[PDB]
Every structure is written in C-alpha cells, then in structure tokens.
C-alpha cells in the first residue's frame, strides 16, 4: 500500500509550477528544501511530500 | 558537603527546562560539577479488560505512563546554597534536597 493520498498529491503539484530548477533530481538535497518554502509542521509528513515531487522529477526527465 | 538534587516527573518538557536552568546556574561562576545522569525510565503499565461486563469478545488494553528521574549533585560549602534556595518549580516536576 504505497499509493499516496490526495493532500500530498495536490501539494506536490504546487511546488514544480514555480520551483523547477530547485527540485534537483537528488532526494537528499531537496528533502529539506521543501521545508524552507513549504511550512510543514511534521517531520514525518514532510518526507513523503518531498518524496512524491522527487518521484515526478524522475519521470518528467 | 555532598548536596544532591532529585527531579522526578512524567512529562518531559518541564523537567528538561528546569534541568537546563539548573545547569545554566551551575555553569555560572565555576562550580566544578558533574552532568545530569539520566536514570532509565520505567513504563508503569497495567493490563485491564475494557468491558465492565463479561459478555463480548476478549479485548484487553494497556494503561501506561512514563517516569523520568534525573539527579544532580553539588560539591562546595554553604555559599552556593543561599541563592539556589529560589524555587524554579513548574507543575508536574518535583524537587528534593539530599546531602551526603
């Protein structure tokens, strides 16, 4: 059951529409970058939301 | 003089705050000291049947909470213990004085 939910999906598409050259194809460099511009009040939640957008940079490549 | 302080509580934030305040006052002047030894917290669990009746499927639960104790010892004559007598006590955490 690795399928993501709505809130991560809708939030994920909010970054790349203006953060293309900042969402680097490496997870480690942007796993904490999202926190700087997306105010997330949970250490666990901020990981998969960064994970999903990182996942799309792989396919969008 | 072997005055030793004890801090016992359940919630963690309040005991962390007072210990940091205590070590900060200990950091003032010189007061060659030992750091806060961290006693290993014992979870106080009791198993109880959820239902007050006997009818129904077997359903148990665990009612538990944590106790964290940290002790700090001071080493010098009565000069320090005339100003540390001020009580920086929050609800929850409790303090006690032990010498020798």
């Amino acid at each position: 059951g690795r399928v993501r939910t709505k809130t991560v999906k809708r939030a994920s598409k909010a970054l790349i529409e203006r953060y293309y050259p900042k969402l680097t194809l490496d997870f480690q460099t942007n796993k904490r970058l999202c926190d700087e511009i997306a105010t997330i009040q949970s250490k666990r939640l901020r990981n998969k939301i960064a994970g999903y957008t990182t996942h799309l940079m792989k396919r969008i490549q | 003089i072997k005055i030793r302080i004890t801090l016992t509580s359940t919630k963690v934030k309040q005991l962390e705050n007072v210990s940091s305040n205590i070590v900060k006052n200990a950091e003032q002047h010189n007061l060659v000291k030992k750091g806060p030894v961290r006693l290993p917290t014992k979870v106080l669990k009791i198993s109880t049947r959820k239902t007050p009746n006997g009818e129904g499927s077997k359903t148990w639960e665990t009612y538990e909470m944590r106790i964290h104790k940290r002790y700090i010892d001071l080493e010098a004559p009565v000069q320090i213990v005339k100003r540390i007598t001020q009580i920086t006590i929050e609800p929850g955490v409790d303090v006690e004085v032990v010498v020798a």
Partner: protein, 56 residues
C-alpha cells in the same frame, strides 16, 4: 518514606479527589478544572471557575 512510583500514583488519585469534589460541590460556580502544584512546605491549588466572585 514512600517509593517515588507509589508517591506519584498517590498524587494522581489525590489529584482525582479534587476533580470530582470541585465538580460536585462548585458545579453551580462554573467549575472548569484544577491545577495542582507541589512545593516544599507550602503548596498551592489552582482552581478554575466562571463565577469567581462566588467561589471566594
């Protein structure tokens, strides 16, 4: 005198003593809750109520 584990649970049931007794006695007084603070020698009990002119 008493083990800290036994001392703390005894504090808890003693804490439960005020909650029901304040609720049962000062119900009309708009009782909300009790904050019990422990301190060497003197100790204070904080009560919460709406009609504070009546609780005094």
């Amino acid at each position: 005198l008493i083990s800290k584990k036994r001392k703390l649970v005894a504090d808890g049931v003693f804490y439960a003593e005020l909650n029901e007794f304040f609720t049962r006695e000062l119900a009309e007084e708009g009782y909300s809750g009790v904050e019990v603070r422990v301190t060497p020698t003197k100790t204070e009990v904080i009560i919460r109520a709406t009609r504070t002119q009546d609780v005094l």
